[PDB]
């Protein structure tokens with residue numbers, strides 16, 4: 001790794017994702033291969049999130065990727081602005097299809113026709129379905145791995161309820177899991193908030209979000225989304241049930257939808273990565289500890305490495321013994337640091353017979369000598385501390401880089417020196433357009449649930465910044 | 469359920485998959501919704517296979533679904549008949565794309581250009597990658613849920629090796645896992661074999677396969693596929709390395725690919741399904757035991773529900789997947805039939821009389837037998853009944869395949885045996901021209917299923933084909 005983050009972030013990012021073996025490029029613009037190292041992080045997030053929404057009663061399923069042409073039109077599910085992003089299939093082989101067929105950019109138009117046929121009474125509610133799947137958005141915006149890709153993997157949850165109280169409660173439960181994914185799995189702090197009228201999903205009532213800060217850019221990014229849809233889609237698609245008390249009266253279902261993507265992995269990369277490459281938070285590292293031998297008799301050195309064995313596996317630590325004879329120790333050192341392995345355990349002959357080893361933390365660079373039989377306890381303590389270290393530096397960097405302005409003067413003074421700032425806000429769109437072009441430019445990120453301090457007149461303190 | 473499996477198979481199948489809540493229909497022909505009841509089975513297969521290939525050193529990844537026109541134009545990875553099955557993206561919104569992009573029907577052309585860049589020396593091998601992903605094949609044959617769908621879910625594994633002996637061993641380990649998915653998870657027996665030259669993947673060296681039999685059809689089906697590709701694809705795609713100890717000879721990697729799909733769930737439905745609905749093998753049933761509570765007081769009623777919720781915890785604690793149906797708006801008789809249609813292996817009936825007699829009742833979905841159990845043996849005995857349901861389901865389907873797969877040595881007995889809804893092992897040339905002949909002669913058709921590794925009888929000392937001498941016993945039959 002030779003590019004440096006603070007000077008050229010784009011090229012640093014591209015060289016970390018490649019030299020960590022996370023991403024391989026493809027010959028289609030905005031499409032990336034997720035190699036096992038990148039995919040294992042996604043799998044870990046999936047394991048966590050899946051387990052959580054299962055306690056909420058959500059069930060997994062799989063809906064078609066193709067949407068019929070007339071099911072896309074149906075109503076103002078999308079105002080035509082979102083239409084350029086939709087890829088259309090028009091032939092199989094050379095045979096032009098009777099009607100063109102669309103590639104899921106989201107699955108409302110595929111799912112809700114089915115909800116309307118499953119809901120024949122209030123006993124059929126709630127419906128709570130989730131799917132892990134790929135989606136295609138023909139993004140015009142300049143493409144980057146995991147940040148802005150043309151195909152990505154995600155989960156989209158879609159739930160329908162008899163009452164507003166239930167739907168409204170889920171929206172905030174899901175948003176909290178998203179925050180837990182980022183803050184507890186990925187050691188990235190986030191700001192919960194609600195979208196302004198400009199930035200909310202046109203198809204919903206309100207849109208909640210979690211926002212993250214990437215210092216080296218000075219830019220924020222939407223990490224996850226949870227919408228209350230009210231009855232916007234229920235009336236559109238006729239998901240209706242009989243009023244239990246009033247004969248002949250249909251009442252429309254209340255709906256939510258929520259989504260999280262592999263953009264998580266890029267954000268973790270942009271947040272924790274350093275000038276030596278990736279840095280993996282322990283709770284998602286598929287290798288938390290790598291064993292590397294340093295320095296015939298030698299077979300005793302490999303038996304000692306392989307005695308860390310289960311001694312680490314038996315304490316349920318993900319461990320890799322890199323015993324390959326074909327690479328130098330120094331090669332292994334740099335190879336696993338580029339991949340972001342939280343702890344390097346080096347065994348040298350000196351230490352086999354002094355019944356010691358050395359551990360090197362990927363965040364601090366600290367090298368530490370441990371008694372041979374203190375491996376289990378102290379290694380666990382280091383991996384827990386690395387996690388807390390990584391979340392603490394990212395917390396204290398968001399504290400530093402998120403401040404207040406009450407004037408356009410100091411908001412602008414502060415925006416352009418790499419800052420995101422909460423400002424009092426009209427709340428109206430054309431004002432938001434106006435702030436967008438003056439500072440060029442800043443978007444609205446979210447109206448925080450717990451803003452700075454207590455507050456056309458200002459309706460809300462709203463967090464502003466340049467954003468992906 | 470209204471249709472009967474024996475009389476009209478399609479409508480019975482259509483009504484089992486829907487009224488069990490496995491499938492919802494879509495407005496695109498050959499595309500189907502996988503509702504939780506069916507998707508949970510896929511997740512169970514996924515969990516097993518994933519563990520197994522992890523021991524073989526295979527790692528999971530995700531490659532793009534889009535294939536460039538120009539990457540598809542470089543190599544010849546497929547014969548010309550497969551080109552129609554490819555769906556093309558030709559515009560975004562209203563803007564026609566400069567070059568069209570194809571939807572993955574399989575991922576050789578997407579992956580192997582990357583393999584070529586990752587492989588620069590012998591220490592870069594082996595490469596062992598797997599992906600769970602969706603695939604589109606614009607099928608001409610008649611589409612049926614989970615049997616033959618235009619979009620499906622699958623796993624495709626692609627591995628690259630330095631030596632031929634490594635590749636050759638993976639092919640059959642993988643195949644044996646497929647047969648394990650079928651025989652141990654779904655209680656379906658299968659026939660391992662090699663495809664004839666006609667039916668093998670044209671661009672590889674040889675194709676191994678497992679075939680399953682659907683009695684009610686008299687039809688067999690390809691349940692899984694494992695290819696040895698030799699070096700046909702390493703030469704096309706230039707996956708080469710130099711060995712320092714073999715100076716001056718270019719080493720092309722030895723490759724395999726293998727695939728298994730949600731056709732699994734369709735086969736399970738056809739094999740074990742009955743005229744009361746789905747029949748779930750305990751090992752993939754996402755609910756193995758359903759607890760149903762079956763006037764006097766409201767405090768008493770809460771105690772009945774507390775006992776059901778105490779059976780649920782005792783059963784989770786012995787790792788039995790359990791759902792307590794505590795919905796108050798349905799009768800017990802209703803819940804009884806609803807969970808039978810869904811194929812739940814065991815119904816647990818708890819009533820007030822059994823609560824104070826410290827008993828419960830279990831009824832098996834495979835035989836229907838009702839059993840009163842002491843409250844204390846719930847964990848031990850319920851576990852035993854699920855293990856016996858599994859063994860029963862696999863035993864009956866085995867005893868149905870032995871019955872329905874026989875040997876014939878004349879085209880004349882081959883025809884009569886075929887026409888009684890059976891699959892036939894016949895002595896066979898192996899040549900393509902002949903295979904077309906059997907196909908239409910038996911229509912006035914039967915195709916080859918596989919060449920069994922362990923055929924019923926040993927062939928030859930110069931035994932002649934059913935035409936040219938016989939090379940091998942070949943398993944022939946009508947097929948999905």
Ligand SMILES: Nc1ncnc2c1ncn2[C@@H]1O[C@H](COP(=O)(O)OP(=O)(O)OP(=O)(O)O)[C@@H](O)[C@H]1O
Nearest residue numbers: 146147148149152222223224225259260261263468
């Ligand atoms: N092209 C993309 N690649 C990866 N992740 C994405 C992409 N577009 C959106 N996401 C993520 O998926 C989630 C789904 O939200 P959605 O796409 O509806 O919001 P959006 O307002 O279009 O977002 P954005 O400004 O990121 O395009 C978002 O929270 C975001 O983090």
Ligand SMILES: Nc1ncnc2c1ncn2[C@@H]1O[C@H](COP(=O)(O)OP(=O)(O)OP(=O)(O)O)[C@@H](O)[C@H]1O
Nearest residue numbers: 605614615616617620690691692693727728729731
């Ligand atoms: N349209 C489909 N829907 C579901 N599963 C399929 C479909 N086509 C193939 N499969 C399954 O995918 C596996 C691997 O795919 P492969 O290309 O080897 O099949 P195939 O030879 O084309 O199959 P088939 O003879 O059924 O057309 C097969 O073992 C089969 O079980």
Ligand SMILES: O=C(C[C@H]1NCCC[C@@H]1O)Cn1cnc2ccc(-c3cccc(F)c3)cc21
Nearest residue numbers: 077078082083085105106109156225257258259
């Ligand atoms: O995905 C969501 C909201 C929510 N869905 C459920 C998961 C969470 C997500 O936030 C809207 N959306 C975002 N980016 C889009 C691009 C195109 C279209 C589009 C274009 C034409 C027709 C059509 F039906 C949809 C929708 C898009």
Ligand SMILES: O=C(C[C@H]1NCCC[C@@H]1O)Cn1cnc2ccc(-c3cccc(F)c3)cc21
Nearest residue numbers: 546550551553554573574624625693725726727
């Ligand atoms: O899928 C396999 C082999 C194996 N892959 C690895 C997983 C297991 C599978 O058996 C060949 N094949 C079968 N059905 C096809 C339809 C179209 C094309 C095709 C591909 C590219 C371009 C094109 F025009 C057509 C290949 C197909």
Ligand SMILES: [Mg+2]
Nearest residue numbers: 082085137139
């Ligand atoms: Mg977008």
Ligand SMILES: [Mg+2]
Nearest residue numbers: 198199200222
């Ligand atoms: Mg936006």
Ligand SMILES: [Mg+2]
Nearest residue numbers: 550553605607
């Ligand atoms: Mg085929």
Ligand SMILES: [Mg+2]
Nearest residue numbers: 663667668690
């Ligand atoms: Mg075939």
Ligand SMILES: [Zn+2]
Nearest residue numbers: 425426431456
């Ligand atoms: Zn204003």
Ligand SMILES: [Zn+2]
Nearest residue numbers: 897902933935
């Ligand atoms: Zn012959």
